């Protein structure tokens, strides 16, 4: 079964550039490759077939190239409507196989998140579990690092981070951490901290409240 | 046009098995043949077999055989992919694609799970913390213990947009899902302006709405 290796897997570039993606054969494919792009929310599309030959109204700035075992996909100007998932897939011999994908996304300055935290709901303490909710929005790039804290002691296996896609308009991302208590032992312990740390800061900021339910 | 109509979605039990179906509208199998592909929650592409009717044909990848079985009905222009023994490893989204992979179906998304349809549970999520109006402030809905997807989160019945973050769900370890919809307002608003979130989930039939007010929090 002939393996198509990927690359890159992740990549940032700006409105009109020249990006190239590659996809290497373990076996001689020869010419019997295509190249595929998954738009956000799940729309697939067929942008080129035999390694280099487009698809009948797929803009002329794709085109397919080859270099040994190595085939590339390259976009001349990088549209908007370019930043999707792009696969290759082999169809020389079966099984029929694909490549890892590259998520290419829109590249702009470094923001510095806008941080936040949510202490539980009375009304959800009665029910036992204790969520608590520390919200970074609108930065870039998505890197970011959520240490929560109680009276300083660090938690761990206890938070799920869940971030946004990247805005249409002004291309930042939006995460949320989530920790998770019971109301037994979120009642035993009164400073729970948020420590962000991000490119865009200089320190790691931390926002915090003292357990006194309101 | 032309295009390959797939089935709904789908929520079985581990154990059991599932059918899928995509009909193909003008091209039919015998010239436009089908290839089923697999895609787990925010996975890549994974080739599961495909279909050669005319040929009698039908070729799978080694790590499907026997767990995925195509058929095809000439008369109807449908493939049907066939997933048995299934478990947690088979919660996808499964897609179709005809001959050359020219034509891309929808997708169908698979759900594996032991648990059951599960009204959420909205709570607020409460501004003024350490706060009292002035600059910016942020406050949110926090929709969790649902099943399955998804929910519908609204501000405001629509009037509020700007500003609202609807975080993709969160599966929890009891199986259950979550996820929360934080809005950015103006601090000066926060007491001369209602902020409700309308969360929606129609396997349950639920249909909330959390007011959000500032605590002195």
């Known amino acids: 079964d002939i393996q198509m290796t990927q690359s890159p897997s992740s990549l940032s570039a700006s409105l009109g550039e020249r990006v190239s993606l590659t996809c290497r054969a373990s076996?001689?494919?020869?010419?019997?490759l295509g190249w595929l792009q998954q738009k956000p929310d799940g729309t697939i599309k067929r942008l080129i077939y035999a390694a280099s030959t487009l698809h009948s109204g797929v803009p002329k700035r794709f085109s397919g190239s080859r270099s040994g075992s190595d085939y590339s996909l390259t976009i001349s100007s990088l549209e908007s409507e370019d930043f999707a998932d792009y696969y290759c897939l082999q169809y020389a011999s079966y099984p029929r196989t694909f490549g890892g994908g590259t998520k290419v996304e829109i590249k702009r300055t470094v923001a510095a998140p806008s941080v936040f935290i949510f202490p539980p709901s009375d009304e959800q303490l009665k029910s036992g579990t204790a969520s608590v909710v520390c919200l970074l929005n609108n930065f870039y790039p998505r890197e970011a690092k959520v240490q929560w804290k109680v009276d300083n002691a660090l938690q761990s296996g206890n938070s799920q981070e869940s971030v946004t896609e990247q805005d249409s308009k002004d291309s930042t991302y939006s995460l949320s951490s989530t920790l998770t208590l019971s109301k037994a032992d979120y009642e035993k312990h009164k400073v729970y901290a948020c420590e962000v740390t991000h490119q865009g800061l200089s320190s790691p900021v931390t926002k915090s409240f003292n357990r006194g339910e309101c | 046009q032309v295009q390959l109509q797939q089935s709904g979605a789908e929520l079985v039990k581990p154990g059991a098995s599932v059918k899928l179906s995509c009909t193909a509208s003008g091209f039919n199998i015998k010239d436009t043949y089908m290839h089923w592909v697999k895609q787990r929650p925010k996975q890549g592409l994974e080739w599961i077999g495909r279909?050669?009717?005319?040929?009698?044909?039908?070729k799978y990848d080694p790590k499907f055989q026997d767990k995925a079985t195509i058929t095809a009905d000439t008369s109807s222009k449908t493939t049907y992919l066939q997933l048995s023994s299934l478990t947690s490893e088979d919660t996808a989204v499964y897609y179709c694609?005809?001959?050359?992979?020219?034509?891309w179906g929808q997708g169908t998304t698979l759900t594996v799970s032991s648990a059951s349809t599960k009204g959420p549970s909205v709570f607020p999520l409460a501004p003024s913390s350490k706060s009292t109006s002035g600059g910016t402030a942020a406050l949110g809905c926090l929709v969790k213990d649902y099943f399955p997807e998804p929910v519908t989160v609204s501000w405001n019945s629509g009037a509020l947009t700007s500003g609202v973050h609807t975080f993709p769900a969160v599966l929890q370890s009891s199986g259950l899902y979550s996820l929360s919809s934080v809005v950015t307002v103006p601090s000066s608003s926060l007491g001369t302006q209602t902020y409700i979130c309308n969360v929606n989930h129609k396997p349950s039939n639920t249909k909330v709405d959390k007011k959000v007010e500032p605590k002195s929090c």
């Open positions: 279909i050669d009717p005319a040929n009698v044909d039908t």
């Open positions: 694609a005809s001959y050359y992979g020219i034509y």
């Open positions: 076996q001689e494919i020869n010419g019997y």
